[PDB]
Amino acid sequence: MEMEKEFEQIDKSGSWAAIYQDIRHEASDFPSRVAKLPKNKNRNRYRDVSPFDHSRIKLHQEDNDYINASLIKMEEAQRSYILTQGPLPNTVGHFWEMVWEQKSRGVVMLNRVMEKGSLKCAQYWPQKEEKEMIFEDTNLKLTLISEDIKSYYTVRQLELENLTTQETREILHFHYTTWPDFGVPESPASFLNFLFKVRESGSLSPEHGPVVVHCSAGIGRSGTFCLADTCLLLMDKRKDPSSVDIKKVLLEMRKFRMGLIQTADQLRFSYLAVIEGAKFIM
Ligand SMILES: N#Cc1ccc(Cn2cccn2)cc1
């Protein structure tokens, strides 16, 4: 079926939970043996969220190459994304090592450091120009260059230096700051505006490594971001945009990382975002 009318048909029939459970039943199951080794217990935020072995990002280190991060490679859309968990106190150095080694231009953050009165990820970037951060385990230095605070999101320019080679790079930090503590946003308008700002920066383009995107677990909000981007790109590329099937795209992405889209409310919100976004594109 088309999307917008499939949408009204699920709303009128109140079957979002049943649609979402079908997706969960059909989703791929692949091994995640490296993630479950005992030496990696403090590298995982949640015991039930792990990268598959076949698509995990490897650090270029011979001691321990493990990080909770996956490469999502979308062949028809010609887009790649790295989805990862919010960094932990003992993985902030690994996180920036990955950004460096994978040649990423942008980092997309979809959570606040504290939500619901608890810490959802480490404070992994510097907050003042004159107070830079040094990650001694991976030999990197990170400096805040500039910051632009808007009503729904903040963009920061960062300088990452490889202290071993003295090479430097500019990284863009796109921080969506207004996703609610409970539920999903009422309108997709600010989320779509944010996605277009990431796109306009070049961070999603083939002349760079894959964008790094995260929330707390790296599957819920993060899944919504890449599902909406990929669906809109396919609607631009194909002769028949109404052939784009959001459930099929989601199942394809779940071949590369488990659990993408965590609730039926996130699924409905993803439909809403693609539907509204397709009107603005033209
Ligand atoms: N000055 C400067 C500078 C250098 C590099 C980058 C990003 N990049 C990753 C791999 C090659 N380039 C961004 C700014």
Side-chain angles (χ1 to χ4, degrees), residues 100 103-105 168-171 208:
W100 182 269
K103 302 179 158 56
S104 307
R105 179 84 191 293
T168 63
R169 280 175 212 161
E170 180 185 331
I171 309 298
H208 302 291

Side-chain angles (χ1 to χ4, degrees), residues 197-262:
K197 297 295 186 186
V198 178
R199 277 185 176 195
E200 288 178 6
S201 78
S203 291
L204 291 164
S205 300
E207 64 248 25
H208 302 291
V211 70
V212 172
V213 357
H214 79 87
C215 45
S216 192
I219 62 175
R221 300 172 199 178
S222 292
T224 297
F225 184 87
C226 61
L227 180 61
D229 183 54
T230 285
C231 284
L232 291 168
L233 211 50
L234 290 169
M235 290 176 79
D236 268 348
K237 215 171 201 255
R238 286 186 185 175
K239 289 184 181 184
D240 179 13
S242 74
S243 70
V244 173
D245 186 339
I246 178 167
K247 299 189 260 49
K248 285 174 178 169
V249 177
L250 178 53
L251 287 164
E252 179 68 23
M253 292 183 161
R254 279 196 178 214
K255 297 174 180 175
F256 301 92
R257 186 168 177 83
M258 64 171 69
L260 305 180
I261 308 295
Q262 280 179 296

